[PDB]
Enzyme design. Sequence first.
Site, PDB file in Angstrom:
ATOM      1  N   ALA C 128     -30.467  40.606 -53.137  1.00  0.00           N
ATOM      2  CA  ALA C 128     -31.445  39.627 -53.606  1.00  0.00           C
ATOM      3  C   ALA C 128     -30.763  38.671 -54.590  1.00  0.00           C
ATOM      4  O   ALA C 128     -31.284  38.382 -55.663  1.00  0.00           O
ATOM      5  CB  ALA C 128     -32.655  40.309 -54.247  1.00  0.00           C
ATOM      6  N   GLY C 132     -35.239  35.318 -54.946  1.00  0.00           N
ATOM      7  CA  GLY C 132     -36.430  34.758 -54.333  1.00  0.00           C
ATOM      8  C   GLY C 132     -37.117  35.727 -53.392  1.00  0.00           C
ATOM      9  O   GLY C 132     -38.344  35.752 -53.304  1.00  0.00           O
ATOM     10  N   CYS C 252     -27.328  34.906 -42.760  1.00  0.00           N
ATOM     11  CA  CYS C 252     -27.114  33.470 -42.665  1.00  0.00           C
ATOM     12  C   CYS C 252     -25.874  33.116 -41.855  1.00  0.00           C
ATOM     13  O   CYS C 252     -25.182  32.151 -42.194  1.00  0.00           O
ATOM     14  CB  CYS C 252     -27.022  32.859 -44.065  1.00  0.00           C
ATOM     15  SG  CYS C 252     -28.538  32.992 -45.048  1.00  0.00           S
TER      16      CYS C 252
END
Lengths: 66, 88, 324, 148, 55, 177
Positions: C128, C132, C252
């Site tokens: 994290a 967010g 990602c």
Amino acid sequence: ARKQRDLKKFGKAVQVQKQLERAKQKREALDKINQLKRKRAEGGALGATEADDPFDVAVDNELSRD
Amino acid sequence: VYSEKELGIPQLNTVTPVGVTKPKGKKKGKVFVDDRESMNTILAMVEAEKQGQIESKIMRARQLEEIREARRIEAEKKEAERKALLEN
Amino acid sequence: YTNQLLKDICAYYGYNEYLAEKLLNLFPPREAFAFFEANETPRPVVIRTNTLRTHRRDLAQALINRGVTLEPVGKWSKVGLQVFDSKVPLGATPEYLAGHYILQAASSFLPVMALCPQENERCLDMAAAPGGKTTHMAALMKNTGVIFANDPSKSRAKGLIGNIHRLGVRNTIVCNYDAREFPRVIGGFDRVLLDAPCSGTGVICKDPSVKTNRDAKDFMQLPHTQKQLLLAAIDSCNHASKTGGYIVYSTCSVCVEENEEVVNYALSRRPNVKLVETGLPFGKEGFTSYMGKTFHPSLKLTRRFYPHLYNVDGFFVAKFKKIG
Amino acid sequence: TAKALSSQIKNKRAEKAARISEEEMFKVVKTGGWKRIVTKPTFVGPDFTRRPVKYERFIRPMGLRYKKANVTHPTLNVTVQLPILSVKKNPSNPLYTQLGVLTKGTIIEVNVSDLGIVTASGKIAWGRYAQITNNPENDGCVNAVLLV
Amino acid sequence: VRLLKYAQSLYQCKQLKRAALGRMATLIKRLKDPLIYLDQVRQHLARLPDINPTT
Amino acid sequence: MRPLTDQEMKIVLDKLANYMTDLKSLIAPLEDGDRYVFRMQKDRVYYVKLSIANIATCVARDKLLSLGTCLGKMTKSGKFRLHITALPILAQNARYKIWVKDNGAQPFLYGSNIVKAHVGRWTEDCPEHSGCVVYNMADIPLGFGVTARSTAEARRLDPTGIVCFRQADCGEYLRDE
RNA sequence: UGAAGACAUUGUCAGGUGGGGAGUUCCUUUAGUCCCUCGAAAUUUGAGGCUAGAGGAGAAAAGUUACCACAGGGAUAACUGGCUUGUGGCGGCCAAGCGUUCAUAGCGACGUCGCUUUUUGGAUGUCGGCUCUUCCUAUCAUACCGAAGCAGAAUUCGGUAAGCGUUGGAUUGUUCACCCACUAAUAGGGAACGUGGACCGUCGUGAGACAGGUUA
């Protein structure tokens, strides 16, 4: 009162050695930076970016793998 | 004017007892009041200090009685824990 | 020719030859060109409202009064908004100072949206770094339950805790552990969140280094690390609970070595896992087989997000349910 | 060949392009010799930062900062303007180091992505050490020699 | 101007003014050739016949 | 990995009662039987649940960093401090509340002391040096501090005067980033 | 003897923690073995083991900082006075000479190259405002010449020159810039920058206040 008397009778000398230490420190700093430049021009071989450790630390580690 | 803690003044056996005193500079003991009842006792003494002067004798008496009940419950729990430790 | 296109793209855009070969394999020449133009094109910035503290229309009215140009981010995200221009800096505005919102990306929207935290639930977040995701889980569950947050580094850890206290989560325990160590140390969480560190090929506008700062050695070590990460997550997860608990994997990275392959490995290793529909409206089908490597046909439900198709960061999702 | 290298870097930049303040903050704080303002050039980085109280009252003025530095590469004999990443060590004063004061001989971290130097394993480097070697207070332009 | 406004010593102002005037000197030094070209075009445009297209 | 000792939790409750009122409500049993118990790690005190402490004690002392919500740390002299991290419980159980405007809250968030023009509406019967909690117009906990003087003296004092001694606010969070 | 009821519940281990209680007085940084184990990987890497280079009275509180507030001590009584101006800095190339012994321990001007720096044309806080005398020129004009595609006219640059004269409006906290009106022209300056609070405190220490005084 003893401590205050010693401080008063010392006076100037504390400041004099303070500037002497502050200039000897800067001399060591410049000498270390010169060693850095010399060793790095002679050789090297790093990663993408700077080592995350603040200075004096990376410089001794580089001098270590020297 | 200097701090009495810094000043090496030995404790004195006045009306308030000295009790058992720790040897100087060597391993002062640790006592935990982690129990909620002890929390309530010390907190109630703190709130007594916070309130301070009151104009009602009945209110003062009830305050004192509540914090006395706090010590009483704390002492009962300590006795129960001592009995449990003796069993173990 | 293929070699001519590879050389032209490498020369004109600065990509490494090996990564360019992977991207050319991933996308056809039209889709590849669109992908490269998109990922050099900067992404928009979104704002997530703090539902615990305020609501969307009030925050939007406040930012319009302060002169910030806003637009709701699709029908999918109620909590989100998109910034066009702002006279007052977003950092210094009273709403941001009090914690009414946070700055982020839609890729930061998607994974916690895939997750469905409920009240009085036990949740884990082993990555994290911005905080967010933990904050948005807290907003979804209305500060009911327990959050465990795990980090490797003190710096992003203190950034995390700053964000958490600014957003008033109030029920998170923040720690510096190993993600692999977390299950054995505690384990037994109703829900687990993994944002696995990856090559970062998804967002080179944020990380222009990934354009070249990705060699075959990294492409080999990173999937192994995230493999151990999913092993840790599936060890942590609880099979049976009063409220259904699910594992969520988000990354990602766009390269296939990072995507669908490690989750195929986890599915093959542990039969207790099934994959369910992750519940995300816009996305792309997961590939059944890419490089001579058969993957379980169930990966159809798996979604993918590309900058060229949607003005979002390149992003990858997976949702799993545990049997025993 | 220095002209060629500079032209290549500049053309790459051109193609890529083609394709509150601390002073007023401190004034508001005073309203709501106590002030010391740093008279030497510095580097901040992020646009807005609220400094811890240990360094809160060290004001640095608007113009005296410099965002980019002129870096000279000892090999390949090329000088290019490159962005300043951060300030690492100012030998004159650790306080100047922490603030970011740019004195003579001060090593900072500089982004060298534009240069494109290739490191071991055929790998590129982005951030490297550079020694500021002029007196920016004497001459506002800030010049460094890269360490390679 | 900002540097001189925050200058702290006479030598500071010395070197700041010297540096600025050096910058303008170097700029004109690079501008050496356009001045010659524009002087030549000025001379001819002066020694250019002037007709009236309308008349 | 210790609970507080006698004098430590005495000073802790001293500050917590100077600032709050219902410390019974804070340390009172819950429905499940779990209790909120004071923790202190690395000379820094935290507020956690007993079950949280039980499930966290399994960790080594050095590796664990934070637990529950940080209340404060004790200085070398032994003086106990409460912080903006402990702000939420302070706002929940505040004794005296002082509300400020936006144009005054912005310097308050910066770190400036409270001015008379800043406050919106006043708490009544406030002692001179009693602790108080500073909110904005939206009842958002902004900070805490010791008032310079009482409500009546604030009324009859100049608007430019200092109202509350600004202890700590939201600044600490973005300080660390 | 009845009841709740397969919920709770208890015990078993495999873990971890532990400053509390008891008792005593290895890890850190580096490289290799690429050897063994566990992994990954279509065959090469990752994590441990192993090896060898350098490090090390205990819960009461401590060490330490070119840091903060406070109180105090120490030090300088204060600045410039052949000072000031028109030509940048960094690195390289070249470079007569000098040098540790020789242009190579090396220092080293003028130039050129690379960065600033390129392919389509507002800054200003307290001030001023007026007049008068004198002086300097680093000269706006008057006088004189040298040069320029200087046809003429109108000009530009340069210098000799201080005798001569050297006005306004806008705008502004206010000045200059810019802007526009006259006018030969509205040039710059000097004149010892020419004449008309800080403690005694008292009430607060996470921050301050005081119709309190001593008063210079």
